[PDB]
Amino acid sequence: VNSFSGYLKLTDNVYIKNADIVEEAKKVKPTVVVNAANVYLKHGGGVAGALNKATNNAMQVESDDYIATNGPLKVGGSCVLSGHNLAKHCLHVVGPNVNKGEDIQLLKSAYENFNQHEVLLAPLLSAGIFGADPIHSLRVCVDTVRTNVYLAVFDKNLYDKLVSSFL
């Protein structure tokens, strides 16, 4: 048993809810929250900008030190950093950004990072401003992640479309 509430069960291991991931993290304090990161860990917009704002910019300060030491992530890659006030840990995962021309085949590689963690609160990778089809992102998630993933979908209209169209 875990602390996640109000989720629809899609599969043995994948759950979904219409929720603001920031508000969900603040309530649950999960072991792992996933960030929709870019390779520079520049948390300006989207889930990343919202998560970073909720940490009062401490996520960005920590991220800048990580990049100064290690250089940029790979598209499809990840790093584990602090979860600050939102979670124990934040798994920063880089899905391909279609609005920058990145290979959508890298979305499966991105989701494979989730398998290193038994339970995660996450957004749909490459959904929203990263420009991918969220229906596709949910299909790759279900077909790739084997650990327990709680997906928080911000847009109510999209949530309903994802559930209604789910095979």
Ligand X SMILES: Nc1ccc(C(=O)O)c(O)c1
What does the binding site for ligand X look like in residue numbers (CB under 6 A)?
20-22, 46-47, 50, 123, 128, 154
Closest CB 21 distance from ligand X, rounded Å: 5
Closest CB 111 distance from ligand X, rounded Å: 17
Closest CB 51 distance from ligand X, rounded Å: 8
**Of all residues in the chain, what percent are helix, strand and coil, respectively (each to 5)?**
40, 20, 40
**By Cβ distance, which residue is nearest to ligand X?**
50
Task: Choose between 50 and 141: whose C-beta lies nearer to ligand X.
Answer: 50
Task: Choose between 48 and 140: whose C-beta lies nearer to ligand X.
Answer: 48
Task: Choose between 58 and 65: whose C-beta lies nearer to ligand X.
Answer: 58
Most distant CA atoms of the chain, gap in Å: 45
Q: 122: number of CA atoms within 13 Å, CB side?
A: 31
* Six-digit token string for 3: 């602390």
Closest CB 70 distance from ligand X, rounded Å: 26
